[PDB]
Chain A
Amino acid sequence: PPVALIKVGKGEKVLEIGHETVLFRHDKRFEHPCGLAILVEDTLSEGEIKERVEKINKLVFDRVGQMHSVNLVALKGSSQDAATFAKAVATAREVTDLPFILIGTPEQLAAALETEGANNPLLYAATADNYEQMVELAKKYNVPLTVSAKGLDALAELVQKITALGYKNLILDPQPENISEGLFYQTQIRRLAIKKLFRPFGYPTIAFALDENPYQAVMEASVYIAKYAGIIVLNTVEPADILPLITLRLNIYTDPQKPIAVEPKVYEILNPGPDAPVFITTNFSLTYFCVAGDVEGARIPAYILPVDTDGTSVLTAWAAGKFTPEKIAQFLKESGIAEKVNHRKAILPGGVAVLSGKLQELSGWEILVGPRESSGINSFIKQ
């Protein structure tokens, strides 16, 4: 295969990257979502390392009904000291289950690997002048190894030297000085791997988005997500900076051939009684959790009926004749929601307010037209 599959970490906190085969998702689909790593310097105090990793653990977000988050902690041996580095990784390890990327000299990684090796970390930096010592450590622990060099030529040659030494569990770093170079490198690595079966480049890459201007780091990371990075490293623990990246990865890595839908049945928010409101919506997962999120968020126990529109949003199914009065009425009977409530009222997305009258006669339910955005549901239920 074009790009080797490489795993960092283990046991379901494991990150699997590689085994990509296209340059454009519409050609097939991108297969393995890139990991996002956050940087932690070993010069921080014990207290500081823990506080930081704890913030890293909080970079988790619910998106379309699933928890998604950053996946690696990149510990950097800025101290230059192996004892300091080893102790810092042990400290970070006490506070998280995320796999690590160990950035440091050979002596720092070796002290650290005595305890961290078991956790299958990614070693950072087999370079032109240390690659021999790094390959030896990587082999002893059979851990993935980043091969780092400036440019495609140097990179490919180092990779050949390392693979000549018998190790192929690799990640690639072509060292771009800016995102112009980054895009270029990522694109070529991916093209040569897939279009030319170029072996030295048949591995996932790692990219860095460390800019202190957070708008810039986010944009640089966004480009890397869209453009083939296998692992991207940032240095921000601000949830606002990671949220859009997690969303972008979710979006870019979604299979284009089919939308993700939720199973069309009634969903209960919190623990609804026969008195709770009934919300009509579609089974497009994005749409349904927009609604579920708003309702649960306002702490409103309720029933949600995601009409099967083949996983299409409300205006999408509507325009495609798949969200008609007839179809919704049939789901009202189909879903078994009647057995659930003492009233006979249902709430329609405000965007299809027009369907009300026809849906009402026909289904025999009192149709209330809700806000156009699920965000106004709390205020609609209050009133």
Chain B
Amino acid sequence: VEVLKEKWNSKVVEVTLGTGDKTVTLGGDSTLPFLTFEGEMPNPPRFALEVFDTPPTDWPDILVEPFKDVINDPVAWAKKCVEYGADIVALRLVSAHPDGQNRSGAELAEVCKAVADAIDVPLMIIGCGVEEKDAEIFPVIGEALSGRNCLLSSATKDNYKPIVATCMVHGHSVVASAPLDINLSKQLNIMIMEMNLAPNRIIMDPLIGALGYGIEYSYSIIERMRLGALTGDKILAMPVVCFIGQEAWKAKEAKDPEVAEWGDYALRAIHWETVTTVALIQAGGHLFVMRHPKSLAEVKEHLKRIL
């Protein structure tokens, strides 16, 4: 018999982040991951490393180690992420939290600009998670970085207008987050597109669980998103981002170095991140936000091999 090759109706749009020589393209797939005998894969998955605007306080020693000299300096930390191979740098504005430092959009915007100017790669800016706060800071952030095509992370169903508004006025792209549910990701996309932001300026965040803590739901949701794009559902034809780092390093298997029943801590902590990544790369994710440089390097070597 003959190699079975699917005739796919459509494709995931190509999203471009950054501007000028520091551009990065994602998406564009007209086939399932790596099945290029029946479709195109214009872009390989892309990876980012996280940089916090304020020093992480609850990070395991093994994760701080690769950034120990730059962890208190967002700019230096971001240059280091590029040095470690990140395609994109992801700045998490933790200090914006209203229950924490509750910093203003103006304060936060100066740091996003500082970081942005210092690196030769595109910038992804993640908020604090509190919808109300994020909607307030992103329009100020988007304004300061106007024209730099950054990726503002997280418009949700309850807060997208201010953020989509900032993307459109100031030329940025947006991440649309909905909790592991096709119809909800779809509804959000529809509402964003209703403001006339183009589908190629949107990346879907299904709000995954790491390996062992919800990864199967994440994996299936992402597969349904890719199949949706391929078969023609224009509402699912957007690239997918997975916050791998954030979730994998929360796993006990990756945080408790003292558990003899699970073997060598250093190895399992890293495999926890690399396996969540390879599994979600197999599901159809496009942008992977990682935390540990070693996980990043090994996945990239894995990608060289599978591509």
Contact = CB atoms under 8 A, between A and B. Distances in A.
A61 B261 CA distance: 8
B282 A238 contact: no
A239 B4 contact: no
Given A26-B220, A216-B301, A223-B306, A251 B4 contact: no
A132 B211 CA distance: 44
A222 B272 CA distance: 11
Contacts of A247: 211-212, 253
B271 interface: yes
B216 A241 contact: no
B107 interface: no
Nearest to B223: A24
Interface in B50-99: none
A247 B253 CA distance: 11
Given A180-B307, A252-B216, A375-B252, A223 B261 contact: no
Interface residues of B, number: 47
A219 interface: yes
A214 B306 CA distance: 16
Contacts of B214: 313
Contacts of B213: 286
Given A226-B279, A243-B262, A248-B279, A24 B227 contact: yes
Contact of A238 (B1, B255, B267, B306): B267
Interface stretch (A138-146, A164-172, A191-199, A265-273): A191-199
- Looking at chain B's contact residues, the main secondary structure is helix
A214 B294 CA distance: 13
A226 B306 contact: no
A180 B261 contact: no
Contact of A192 (B1, B34, B282): B1
B169 to A, nearest CB: 33
A188 B268 contact: no
Interface centre among B215, B216, B262, by most chain A C-beta atoms within 10 angstroms, is B216
Contact of B265 (A214, A215, A240, A375): A240
A238 B263 CA distance: 7
A156 interface: yes
Given A178-B305, A243-B262, A188 B271 contact: no
Nearest to B227: A24
A125 B227 CA distance: 37
Contacts of A178: 305-306
B282 A239 contact: no
Interface string A283-312: 000100010000000000000000000000
A219 B278 contact: yes
B275 A188 contact: no
Interface string B129-150: 0000000000000000000000
Given A196-B4, A215-B274, A240-B268, A252 B306 contact: no
A14 interface: no
B267 A240 contact: yes
B298 interface: yes
A201 to B, nearest CB: 8
Contact of B3 (A152, A238, A241, A242): A152
B6 to A, nearest CB: 9
Given A156-B1, A252-B216, A375-B256, A216 B211 contact: no
Nearest to A226: B282
Contacts of B282: 222-223, 226-227
B224 interface: yes
B71 to A, nearest CB: 23
B85 to A, nearest CB: 15
A57 to B, nearest CB: 14
B299 interface: yes
Given A184-B37, A375-B252, A215 B270 contact: yes
Contacts of A191: 4
Nearest to A199: B1
B222 to A, nearest CB: 10
Given A180-B305, A188-B4, A375-B256, A251 B262 contact: no
B253 A256 contact: no
B7 interface: no
B262 A240 contact: yes
A216 B271 CA distance: 10
B263 A240 contact: yes
A243 B253 CA distance: 9
Nearest to B1: A198
Interface string B191-220: 000000000000000000001111111011
A62 B259 CA distance: 13
B245 to A, nearest CB: 16
A302 B278 CA distance: 39
Given A216-B302, A219-B298, A240-B271, A195 B3 contact: no
Contact of B216 (A63, A195, A256, A290): A256
A179 interface: yes
Interface of A: 24-26, 61-63, 152, 156, 178-180, 183-184, 187-188, 191-192, 195-196, 198, 200, 213-216, 218-220, 222-223, 226-227, 238-245, 247-248, 250-252, 254, 256, 286, 290, 313, 375
10 contacts: A25-B220, A180-B305, A215-B270, A216-B305, A219-B278, A226-B282, A240-B271, A241-B268, A244-B212, A251-B219
* Top 6 A-B pairs, shortest CB-CB distance: A239-B263, A240-B263, A240-B267, A240-B264, A240-B268, A215-B298
Given A188-B4, A215-B294, A222-B278, 17 more contacts: A63-B212, A180-B34, A180-B306, A191-B4, A215-B270, A216-B302, A216-B305, A218-B271, A219-B302, A222-B274, A240-B266, A242-B263, A247-B253, A252-B219, A254-B216, A256-B217, A256-B220
